[PDB]
A paper describes a structure:
Mtb FAS-I is an α6 subtype complex, composed of six long polypeptide chains with an overall molecular weight of ~2 MDa. Each of the α chains has seven catalytic domains and is 3069 amino acids long. The mycobacterial FAS-I has a distinct capacity to elongate fatty acids beyond C16, to C24/267,8, which are further elongated to meromycolate (C56) by the FAS-II system and then condensed with C26 to form mycolic acids. Here we report the 3.3 Å resolution structure of the ~2 MDa FAS-I from Mtb, determined by single particle cryo-EM.
A 3D map with D3 symmetry imposed was reconstructed from a final data set of 40,160 particles at 3.3 Å overall resolution with good angular coverage. Out of seven functional domains of Mtb FAS-I, we modeled the six domains that make the barrel-like cage. The density for the ACP was weak and thus we did not model it (see Methods section). The localized reconstruction revealed orientations of the ACP which were not observed in the context of the whole complex, however the resolution of the ACP within the sub-particle classes was similar to that obtained using 3D classification of the whole complex. This indicates that the ACP domains are not rigidly held in a single position within the chamber but rather occupy a continuum of closely related orientations and possibly conformations. Putative docking of ACP domains to the KS modules is partially mediated by a long loop (residues 2210–2226) that projects from the neighboring ketoacyl reductase (KR) module (KR-loop). Negatively charged surfaces are also found near the catalytic sites of the acetyltransferase (AT), ER, dehydratase (DH), and KR modules, suggesting that in the case of Mtb FAS-I electrostatic interactions may also mediate attachment of ACP to the catalytic modules but with an opposite charge as in the fungal FAS-I system. The catalytic cleft of the ER from Mtb FAS-I is wider compared to the fungal-ER, and the flavin mononucleotide (FMN) co-factor in Mtb FAS-I is more exposed compared to the FMN in the fungal FAS-I. This difference is mostly due to the local amino acid composition rather than changes in backbone conformation. The catalytic cleft of the KR module is also much wider in Mtb FAS-I compared to fungal FAS-I. More striking is the larger inner volume of the Mtb DH catalytic chamber compared to the fungal protein. The extended catalytic clefts of the KR, DH, and ER modules may reflect evolutionary adaptation of Mtb FAS-I for producing the unusually long C26 fatty acids; larger clefts are probably required for accommodating the longer aliphatic chains, while the ACP-attached pantothenic acid reaches into the active sites.
Residue numbers in the entry:
A (entry chain B): 2419 to 3061
B (entry chain B): 2021 to 2288, 2297 to 2308, 2321
C (entry chain B): 712 to 856
D (entry chain E): 2564 to 2853
The structure:
């Protein structure tokens, strides 16, 4: 006690005399990994399909903040500023003084205080979390419930006309008595026994956990007008947000594309997944309750009309619009149809992607279907709110549903070279598959291994060998892994079969990446999450962890090749990554493969003077895109200006 | 009348001090070593060659009980280290493959141990670490099971695990006879969870061999509680541990005769006198 | 032109040419400037050659006003706090109010010696209203527009 | 539209105490609760301001359309009754059309499997909207308490129609792409089948598409008002079978019909090697935006 009181109390304080604050850094360019080394390719850049743009919208917002929370488990100052701008916590005003102001209280915030005053709020608002209603309506309208009561009694009424009373009692007059009331200028129907009346009680199953959009997502802050947001469906609103994000993140306008190619060589194949489930239930609830819904929403509720709004407003392309529905691989099949259109020559810049939404009808139907995570079962097992989605884990009992998706921008290598565009990856192979005869529906699919028939004579191996990627160079598998009891070990079996069909050397590792633990199973817009994740992995070299994994399931142990990662492996110039493989095992007998190769394949295809000038122009366009986002985040001149 | 009877006799906070915590749905199994072995093979390549000699025996002996797969991947990393020219790493991965081939069970083979009261930085935690290092089947009890402790026990397993070691982790109050009886029934008969269409096999059946009652009673001092505390902690030692040894000796009785449980008692001047008084009952 | 917002943006470049003619000129576009370019342009406008023969604050201090010298030190400190790779903590700065601050040329060269990316990294979009409301305040009026 | 407010007695049914409590969970601030032990329940009685839904359902009569023949029994083809009951009728029609196409050109898919590998046969039947009748059947069963199957929310999807076709009939492992443009689904499915054959990804593609008009379909199209108004056309004095009159002076909108079908694309090498009846040669297939 007497030698503990002395040292702890009189511990002196030493503060530096300079002591200046720290401010969020100005937008500097990206720092990628030191790129790998392979030889010049004999492939001409007319025969390459590259991924130039790309943006997403999901449970963490943009792909920047989603990847930052994916890797380093915390946001940077720019990510905090972006999410606080987006979720309405911060506005820019300049009438007292130019600066960011708080929304509810209205004060000049300091840039030094941004993270330390706004990190916890956006971490609460952003992530896998409990269902929070963002419709500003009553939750007691949409739930199945049984009522059957029979009524034999008096009917008190309202002032209607004689014709309206007669039209009411048109169905009635064999089960009732009619009495006229001249004081109300109407009739009164009074129905006998056997008359049932609908008495709608609406139940409440509480605490659905999901992967919603950030709470308070205001798409008007991008630049979309309020009448646009009110009239148009919110899937199309999100599609406009994602598309303008992709173009202004890779530094375009579609006007420059129209300068360099003809408008019939630009397509748009954004096949939205289901197409306005919320919009259709909104139509029917307005039809029942008498809400003045517009009389053309039955026309423009269709799923093609989302990207038709995108074409008739933003891109103006005359080209081949194909909108596919497979409802858990829409983005994958849209990407493979965009790439084989470019392999034809029907187009030279394709905007592909897809979006999803969970409804009350969606969660009720999936709860009746019972392959999703039961909240009561998981809280009986004692699992917290942010870790329901646990792929390759022993305590997995179904998937977590999320809402979102996005868009990617495919382009031919000739446009990429001629415009100087930032190539994010090189698409080597994209393909979809069926599964065949399985009358018993709990029997899952396996027939996505048709890409590897013949060993080295297979088209997958042949395309990788054209790009100069051997069988052992495939390093990272971004698996589907919805965290159900069924689709994890058979997909492990599928990638094992593809590995020893391509002739993988014995014991070469495959880094398993599975970010469905992070986001959730957005249904038809998951392949855009996987492609943005794999492009960013091939850029930076890092490998993200599976933070919701505790114990790897036992029957995966036969896999001779996988590496399940639990901590952020930072691969600098220590282990170069050269390829990556996706899968998407969609709903109802559909599968999809797509490989991706590091952009130095594109840089190695061309000639050694044009490669230097190309790197100059592409780095300039990336830097200009992110500092244009910084100008929009601070001052004004907002994105999506409509002439 | 009954609640102020219990208030006058035992204490005011008696039901919350004695309330049962145990539930068999919240048991956590940590028996994955092959996966963490593969990831450790990767991060040995990521760490530089200068810091390998600082842990050269330890890194050679962590991968002793592992699989054929870990052996083959160690040979792959050896070949790539020879190609790159990392002479320390090449011999290290050769040593790792040669060690991971070996099939023999360890020091503590099949010794189903039960350790109570293993917190962060404690003698019971070090005993759990050495038992997992030998390759035992440890069943650790703890008070509350949350994110911090779950991360702690998971990193404890992935650091100190070897050959066929398994760590099971339950939340059980060591001051409730209901929890002690439920805990010995759980360690006794199996636990098979069944969903709708089918069933899931979880816990086979277990008969223990060791027992380590290091149960810390309570760390609360903001109540002026010493009169009731001076008997409640004496409960927590004496009758909890002898009820425990009775149950654990009972559960493997008629199946396996001549199979004898083994207990190690801790005794921690006046504290040693209290310990000896706890002994000679 | 004055008092007419659209007529300003109509004949903007003529105004820039006339102000570059006169002896109270405009900058460049300040949102496109580099930090090194920003500080060198400020010192070129205020000090210039060390050639002035009117109402100095003292002999040996080239600044005509204390508001001009702490103007310059606040721009230096925001250049420090902005270019350093940290966003949270109090950091030891330079420029402890000395002859190193009284000499502007050695002040800038001491910045570029520590931060080499001050020559390349352009200005943050939230430092332009900082610079406007910094020049706006309550002293001797500034030597530019 | 109904909105009446009720201030009166609530006569009830024999429910449990827990079911009565779960009913009055939303109620208890707008009501009075009285227990009835003779019925072993409670009784809620709600005050003024309480509205009850009193659903009157109107009837706009005499819609003219292009329906399937009245009394179309697809079981006479060979589709079993439980198949017809459980599976959606768009998928029933798709099975009928597909077996019609194969047995009209004289195949089985077994001969195709004899001559080529099963990964070179695709199926790109993108059905147009995908069970409008099925979705309103789901929601009406959910309201009325009809024992709908608990997997129809899973297998209501538009890809799952031709996935039933694949998992039952053709057994092809190949590239299944199902497009939706809702008035050119068959056209875009045909052009994606032909450029898959131009790649080499397949050698026999089953393309096509189907549609359906619902009560929701005709009500929404009547609110949209580009279809033929029956009152307007009978005011102009046009008979029942001649509403659809393209390139005519008295045209005032389209007539909706239900149906569709399938076509079978194949490469000329298979056509020569198997001896197949070529019906046409596709020279150009292409889609566009505006």
């Amino acid at each position: 006690r007497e030698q503990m009181s002395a040292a702890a109390a009189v511990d002196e304080d030493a503060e530096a005399p300079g002591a200046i604050a720290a401010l969020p850094s100005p937008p500097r360019g990206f720092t990628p990994a030191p790129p790998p080394q392979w030889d010049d390719l004999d492939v001409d850049p007319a025969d390459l399909v590259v991924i130039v743009g790309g943006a997403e919208i999901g449970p963490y917002g943009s792909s920047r903040t989603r990847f930052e929370m994916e890797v380093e488990n915390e946001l940077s100052a720019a990510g905090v500023l972006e999410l606080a701008w987006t979720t309405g916590l911060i506005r820019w005003e300049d009438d007292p003084q130019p600066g960011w102001y708080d929304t509810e209280s209205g004060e000049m915030v300091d840039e030094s205080e941004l993270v330390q005053r706004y990190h916890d709020a956006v971490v609460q608002r952003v992530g896998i979390r409990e269902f929070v209603d963002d419709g500003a309506i009553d939750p007691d309208h949409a739930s199945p419930l049984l009522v059957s009561v029979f009524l034999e009694k008096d009917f008190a009424f309202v002032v209607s006309s004689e014709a309206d009373a007669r039209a009411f009692v048109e169905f009635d007059p064999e089960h009732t008595v009619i009495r006229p009331v001249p004081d109300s200028t109407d009739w009164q129907v009074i129905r006998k026994a056997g008359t049932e009346i609908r008495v709608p009680r609406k139940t409440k199953l509480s605490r659905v956990v999901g992967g919603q959009i950030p709470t308070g997502f205001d798409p008007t802050v991008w630049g979309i007008s309020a009448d646009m947001a009110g009239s148009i469906d919110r899937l199309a609103v999100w599609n406009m947000v994602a598309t303008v994000d992709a173009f202004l993140s890779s530094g375009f306008s579609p006007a420059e594309v129209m300068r360099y190619v003809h408008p019939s060589l630009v397509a748009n194949t954004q096949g939205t997944g289901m197409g306005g489930g919320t919009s259709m239930q909104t139509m029917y609830h307005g039809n029942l309750l008498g809400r003045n819904k517009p009389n053309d929403i039955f026309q423009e509720v269709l799923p093609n009309i989302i990207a038709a709004h995108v074409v008739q407003s933003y891109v103006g392309s005359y080209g081949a619009m194909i909108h596919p529905v497979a409802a858990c691989a829409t983005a994958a099949v849209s990407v493979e149809e965009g790439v084989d259109k470019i392999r034809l020559g029907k187009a030279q810049l394709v905007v592909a992607g897809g979006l999803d939404d969970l409804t009350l009808e969606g969660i009720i139907g999936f709860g009746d279907m019972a392959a999703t995570a039961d909240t009561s079962m998981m809280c009986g097992r004692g699992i917290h709110d942010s870790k329901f989605s646990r792929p390759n884990d022993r305590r997995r009992l179904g998937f977590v549903e999320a809402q979102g998706g996005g868009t990617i921008l495919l382009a031919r290598g000739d446009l990429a070279l001629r415009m100087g565009l930032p190539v994010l990856a090189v698409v080597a192979f994209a393909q979809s598959f069926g599964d065949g005869v399985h009358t018993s529906i709990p029997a899952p699919g396996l027939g996505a291994l048709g890409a590897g028939r013949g060993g080295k004579d297979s088209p997958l191996a042949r395309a990788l060998a054209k790009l100069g990627v051997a069988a052992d160079d495939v390093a990272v598998i971004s698996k589907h892994d919805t965290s159900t009891l069924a689709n994890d070990p058979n997909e492990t079996e599928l990638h094992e079969r593809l590995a020893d069909a391509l002739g993988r050397s014995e014991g070469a590792p495959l880094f398993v990446v599975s970010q469905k633990s992070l986001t959730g199973h957005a249904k038809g817009g998951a392949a855009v999450f996987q492609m943005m994740g794999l492009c960013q992995i091939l850029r930076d070299g890092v490998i993200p962890p599976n933070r919701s994994l505790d114990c790897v399931d036992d029957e995966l142990a036969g896999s001779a090749h996988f590496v399940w990662v639990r901590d952020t492996l930072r691969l600098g110039g220590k282990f170069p990554l050269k390829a990556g493989m996706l899968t998407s095992l969609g709903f109802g007998h559909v599968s999809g493969l797509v490989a991706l190769v590091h952009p130095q394949a594109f840089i190695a295809s061309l000639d050694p003077a044009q490669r230097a000038d190309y790197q100059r122009r592409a780095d300039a366009r990336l830097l200009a895109g992110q500092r244009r986002l910084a100008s929009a985040i601070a001052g004004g001149a907002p994105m999506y200006q409509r002439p | 009348e009954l609640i102020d009877l219990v208030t006058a006799e035992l204490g005011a906070d008696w039901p919350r001090l004695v309330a049962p915590v145990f539930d068999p749905k919240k048991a956590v199994v940590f028996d994955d070593r092959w996966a963490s072995a593969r990831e450790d093979l990767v991060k040995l390549w990521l760490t530089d060659e200068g810091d390998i000699d600082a842990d050269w025996p330890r890194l050679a002996e962590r991968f002793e009980g592992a699989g054929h797969v870990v052996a083959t991947q160690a040979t792959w990393w050896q070949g790539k280290s020879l190609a790159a020219g990392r002479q320390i790493h090449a011999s290290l991965y050769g040593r790792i493959a040669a060690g991971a081939e070996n099939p023999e069970p360890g020091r503590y083979g099949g010794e189903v141990a039960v350790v109570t009261g293993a917190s962060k930085g404690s003698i019971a935690a070090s005993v759990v670490a050495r038992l997992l290092d030998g390759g035992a089947t440890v069943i650790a009890t703890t008070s509350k099971l949350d994110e911090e402790r779950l991360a702690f026990y998971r990193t404890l397993y992935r650091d100190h695990a070897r050959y066929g070691a398994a760590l099971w982790l339950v939340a059980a109050n060591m001051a409730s006879y209901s929890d002690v009886d439920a805990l010995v029934e759980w360690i006794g008969t199996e636990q098979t969870e069944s969903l709708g269409p089918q069933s899931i096999h979880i816990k086979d059946a277990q008969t223990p061999t060791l027992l380590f009652p290091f149960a810390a009673p309570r760390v609360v001092g903001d109540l002026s509680e010493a009169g009731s505390r001076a008997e409640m902690e004496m409960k927590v030692l004496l009758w909890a541990v002898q009820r425990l040894i009775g149950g654990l000796s009972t559960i493997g009785a008629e199946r396996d005769i001549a199979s004898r449980l083994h207990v190690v008692l801790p005794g921690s001047d006046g504290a040693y006198g209290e310990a000896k008084s706890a002994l000679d009952a | 032109v004055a008092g007419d917002a659209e007529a300003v943006a109509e004949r903007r470049d003529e105004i820039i040419a006339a102000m570059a003619k006169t002896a109270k000129p405009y900058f460049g576009d300040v949102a496109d400037m580099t930090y090194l370019q920003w500080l060198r342009r400020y010192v070129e406008l205020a000090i210039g050659e060390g050639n002035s023969t009117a109402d100095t604050a003292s002999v040996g201090s080239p600044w005509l006003a204390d508001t001009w010298r702490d103007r310059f030190e606040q721009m230096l400190q925001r250049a420090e706090a902005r270019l350093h790779p940290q966003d949270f903590g109090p950091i030891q700065t330079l420029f402890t109010d000395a002859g190193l601050l009284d000499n502007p040329q050695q002040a800038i060269a001491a910045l570029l010696a520590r931060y080499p990316d001050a020559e390349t990294v352009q200005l943050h979009p939230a430092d332009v209203p900082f610079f406007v409301t910094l020049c706006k305040t309550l002293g001797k009026p500034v030597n530019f527009v």
